[PDB]
């Protein structure tokens, strides 16, 4: 510890390999999709649609 810096931990250890697993996740699956009548068309409304 050092009052200017803070905790400079030398944590950085090996005694056992990493705890469970890392993260592979959502990825949101972007879809290439054009607008075209009645397959994909815009909505009309009064309040703004975002």
């Amino acid at each position: 510890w050092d009052p200017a810096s803070g905790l400079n931990m030398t944590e950085s250890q090996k005694g056992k390999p990493a705890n469970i697993t890392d993260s592979l996740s959502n990825r949101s699956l972007i879809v290439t999709t054009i607008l075209e009548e009645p397959y994909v068309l815009f909505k009309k409304s009064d309040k703004p649609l975002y």
């Binding site: 909505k43 009309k44 409304s45 009064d46």
Partner: protein, 50 residues
Amino acid sequence: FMSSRRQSVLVKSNEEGIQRVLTSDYAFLMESTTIEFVTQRNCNLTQIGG
């Protein structure tokens, strides 16, 4: 159809819903106990469905 134009077609009362049927071209959705009262006091309106 109604949520797109909530300013246009949706009204504030039963009275303002009957006046827009009598003047405009409109299909106001009442409850069946105040369709029976309107279609006796005014013989130019009707109940469409069941």
